[PDB]
Symmetry: D2
Subunit: 393 residues, 4 copies
């Protein structure tokens, strides 16, 4: 096979194909540390040392770039190490801006590599209105997590990309978009003036919950050589095994996301018709979504994704309740898995954060977050129903 501007599905199946003399339709698992060489100076095949590069990683990387309509890609130990290679690629003592509704990741990473006080950070909700007033103070990074977790607030990647060129032209301010929740299938941030697309491969891409891997894609060659250097040097790289496993699960990503999203929409609509036991509902798929205009311009076919957020006509109990009365959806952490899961950001995730903010940024104390899996739609829909009542009673 040899792609030539085929469709997404065709690309998932063959992008990042491999090189085998034997003729293996399937890629082998190369865990080899080192490789023999023709002359001391240079190898008996493009590979010299695993960490520097190995076939499984390299190939998973070529695949994620393509799927992400990007020229380049790099896999790391996790999503956290990926965000972190980015932050440490920043000139010493810099500043970065990011949406509020973010994983504690930024909090963490942003700060750590900001050893003692290194990389400044000014969290900001509503990106398009405070970015100009904030765009400087040493800024060099703009971090957007398109659909926020759990509120699900979509952001206009283009309006941001522009607003930057405007309020900070000449100072190399790169824009990074976290595209984990939608996944390469639903959207491609680079196609909207984004310098780097970052994913937590643990979720959708691998999609089977058995690999903690992260990846980034960029069309900017220099920004990609720097970032790869840090990779080769700080060594927060992925295991040939995890890459290969992830590479394998991404081949059904288009299939798994399509299904996962239809179902989500069919579940949101249901919860958005029950004026009774359902207070608010969050799902970028609903035409009533606050930024549905962006959905239609960044989301393929306007798929809402697999995440749905909603608050019931009750309180913390009903929610903590729903989280258990459930039979098919499994209470836990994480998401984007092959199996349905549901979590209450407030308690589970957003812990060390006073209810003070868990009302402001959106994280309502009585909010139930859910990750739609690929189980039968009706078996799941009917299940959400069967659980509302329980909570109510």
């Amino acid at each position: 096979t040899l792609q030539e501007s085929d469709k997404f599905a065709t690309k998932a199946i063959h992008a990042g194909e491999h090189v085998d003399v034997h003729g293996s339709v399937i890629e082998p698992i190369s865990l080899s540390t080192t490789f023999k060489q023709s002359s001391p100076a240079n190898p008996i095949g493009t590979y010299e040392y695993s960490r520097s590069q190995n076939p499984n990683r390299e190939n998973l990387e070529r695949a994620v770039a393509a799927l992400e309509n990007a020229q380049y890609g790099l896999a790391f130990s996790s999503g956290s190490a990926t965000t972190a290679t980015i932050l440490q690629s920043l000139p010493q003592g810099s500043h970065a801006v990011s949406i509020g509704d973010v994983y504690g990741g930024t909090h963490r990473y942003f700060t750590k590599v900001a050893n003692a006080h290194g990389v400044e950070t000014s969290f900001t909700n509503d990106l398009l209105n405070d970015l100009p007033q904030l765009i400087k103070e040493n800024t060099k990074l703009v971090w957007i997590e398109t659909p926020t977790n759990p509120t699900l607030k979509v952001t206009d990647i283009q309006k941001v990309a522009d607003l930057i060129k405007k309020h900070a032209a000449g100072q190399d301010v790169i824009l990074v978009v976290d595209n984990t929740f939608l996944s390469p299938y639903i959207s491609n941030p680079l196609n909207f003036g984004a310098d780097i697309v970052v994913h937590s491969a643990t979720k959708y891409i691998n999609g089977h919950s058995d690999v903690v891997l992260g990846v980034l894609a960029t069309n900017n060659k220099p920004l990609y050589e720097r970032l790869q250097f840090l990779q080769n040097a700080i060594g927060a790289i992925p295991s040939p095994f995890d890459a290969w496993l992830t590479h394998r699960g991404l081949k059904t990503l288009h299939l798994r996301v399509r299904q996962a999203a239809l179902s989500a929409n069919k579940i949101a609509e249901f919860l958005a018709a029950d004026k009774e036991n359902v207070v608010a509902v969050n799902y970028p798929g609903l035409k009533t979504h606050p930024n549905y205009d962006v959905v239609l311009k960044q989301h393929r076919d306007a798929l809402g994704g697999g995440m749905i957020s909603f608050r019931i006509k009750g309180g913390a109990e009903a929610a903590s309740k729903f989280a258990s009365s459930t039979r098919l959806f499994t209470l836990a952490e994480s998401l984007g898995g092959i199996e349905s899961l549901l979590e209450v950001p407030a308690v589970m995730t957003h812990g060390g954060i006073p209810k003070e903010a868990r009302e402001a940024s959106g994280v309502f104390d009585d909010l139930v977050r859910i990750s739609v899996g690929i189980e039968d739609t009706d078996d799941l829909l009917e299940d959400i129903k069967q659980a509302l009542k329980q909570a109510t009673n």
Copy 2:
């Protein structure tokens, strides 16, 4: 089993034991991303998210700590990520000192995390004499690679710890020892006034070269909690698979290192009587070793390790010769491999470092560096011989 201050070998086999309701003698490979929870608040068992912690990694770490006579252990994606995690725990804008004869590692990591010019670095040969004059200039770390590659100079970990307490008491200067080549079986730096022990697990712990992973061990609960935070936050973590494989590999570590040492020594004694074709020989196990006194106070039973370094009765050729004529020792990089290898630091390794230094630090141009594996001693002894002449001829 339940260890109770048993012997190294017993600990290698039962430290880091696992829990399994099915009563498995062998620890299963857990790749799950998440774990179910009884109540939104907390899990149906001690684990919540694989990156935060998972059975395979955690057991590996208890095992490594055990063998290192240490209370705590942490595993990461690689040696380089382990050194990294340590330098980024240092307060912003800090300095460190380290023996000259080091892997490019320090240079790299030390600088990278010293974003632009962050973590200072003053390399120094002969630690015990220039350390007091250097102990400041912003120093917070002293890095020691006990057996220097490839000169094989041994450093007294105690004298350095003491010297530190003297010329810089009151400044939390932590001492880290890279104990990779010797491995936990041959030495335990914590027992000599070292605050952290580092291992690139690929060489001898895993011992089969089929895994890139690194770990550290400490007795200091605070330093361990900080380091663990960065572990969870930057996410430069190992794959439950590479961790489980490495743990599997660790179980024959006492056997594998013991052998590799008896043979290295019996080989060193051979090259140490051939006054003809042998210029010099470097093996910490020879009673004629410069710091043999330190070998005696820090090396179990005085084993020298499996790394011999020697200079033949000729030059660049005779070495580049040997490096090939050999039948049993395989020309490449790396080491600590189960299989016998051989490398010429100068070329293969220390590249972009002008001959100027490659005669300074000790990295002689006509020096042959070998890594004794586990084949038959005599088969190996005899091969080294049949190899001298080739070179000669």
Copy 3:
């Protein structure tokens, strides 16, 4: 989760659930050979010896049985060893009947286990008409490969089941149906008076062609107990890894096959309207299929499967041509791969069998066989076209 007569998709996700005290959502890979015991008599948990039974294999077996709407399942090293265990459970020196359009598998296995001349074998095309005439001569087995490779002739599993109770009631003649190409999703032979369903898990269940493993399922307890005995005594079992990897791969079986089918169906009808370059088309999904009456009664939603067989308006070349000119369809062997493949049964497969037969059973010398993967539909449809011409010219 705990299924309760849910839909296929839900079963595929939750059938064969595992048990683990750490509450992992994903089943761990258990490779362990043995299990600890409380007392000499019996284990500290349901398992005693891996080959006798281990969690990964057991859970897959339940999973497969469920998706196959059956009470029992058994996994072996391969399709072939699955067929053997069966043939070798037949009373010494017996006879069996099977549709001609069969893999060489029957040939081999049936023969081998028929040591020297043990298990008789009377291949017979057109089952329903000569089965009464051959039902005896020592028969004890009738082997149906529902969609014949490659002709794609569908057989009525009921009509045969009945015929048998007729021309041989009172002689335990077991009906075995190979349900590999269609897979549990498209059909369930048990629901049609079949004693055993077989699958070569390599193609569609594991799906990603990275595992050789076979399984069967039956509702018959005795037959299952004998078979399971041979399994434990000959030991032709798969490895816990191969089992887990297959299990992982089945979780998207419904998404994968449903797709491959709609695509296969859309590429048939195209090929089935080009009266010009297309002679005949073979796709159980066309309402013009010889046994489309049987397709409607046995195939779910009337899916045709992902196997299309057709003959262009030319000869050998044009076919061998097509098998190359194609860009998206990868020329090779096997099939039911995640990726589109095409083969010419005659050459590639049906070798050591004279053109004599290769015009009889239907294996036409100018017949193009293709397996539909999960690449984009139009990319593939458009590609078949792009291929027809090349061959033409």
Copy 4:
């Protein structure tokens, strides 16, 4: 590397080397089902189909054969599958002979492929005295389990090979010897007139208790080609992963087996000087062993192995007691593991066999059988002591 009649440890580390253009010092895991082809006729590399052959198996096979001082090797799903292929390779309606003290393996297998009543089987204890009288009755196979499990009775492979040439010249009676318990290291049955060496690689070869794989070796090219035939046709093949994991355990076979043996010997002497609490003790390494003369001619350095067997100065309780009072040894089935194990053949193993026999073959009801691992020797010795008293009190 290129072996040239080097020593066992050298062959262990290099026999079975692989082919990689890249130059991997470490053999990669090839799971690929298939391989591409130069021309429809023959591939683009000596491999065409995984089953017919794949690198990981083949390389394993080469290594085992080499360690077994043999020309040929063949791996299978299990020891059982390996015994199975051998029995089904026999001419329809044959007879075999094997030592009484055997694993239910002959029993099951010998009988199964002996469909209904196919391959005869006359179990005999004391081989050299009843072999002439039984040698016929249709016999074609003579199965010898050198050290019997668990009495630990040694048999003279030469006396029996000879005895066969005398009482049955001309009838191709092949002699197979189960070399599992001693392993390639301690003995090489072919060098003693044996036509086939069988091993359960689950035990000492892989030796980490995470793989069920069996392998045989023979110098007889015709017997090897028939047997490989059945292999390819029945499909009871090992997986690429299990072969790879095993090959990786075999690299320390000589170090592990060397240690397990010294320990078991030092433990047997202890139990053979405790006139008080130890009735009898079975260990082929004690000069007082009934067949010590054979030991000294078949066993390397006269190593007794890792399996001891003994009866305590009490009865059934004292034993069941011992089997639990132990801290370091682990009560379970199996053996040859890296970690110590202990079992009571009577109950655990030999269940469905009336006490009647369990006093005949020697499987005394008050007999404790132990599998010495590689933990420290004194820790284990001191642990056996500490447990005799427990059983006593």
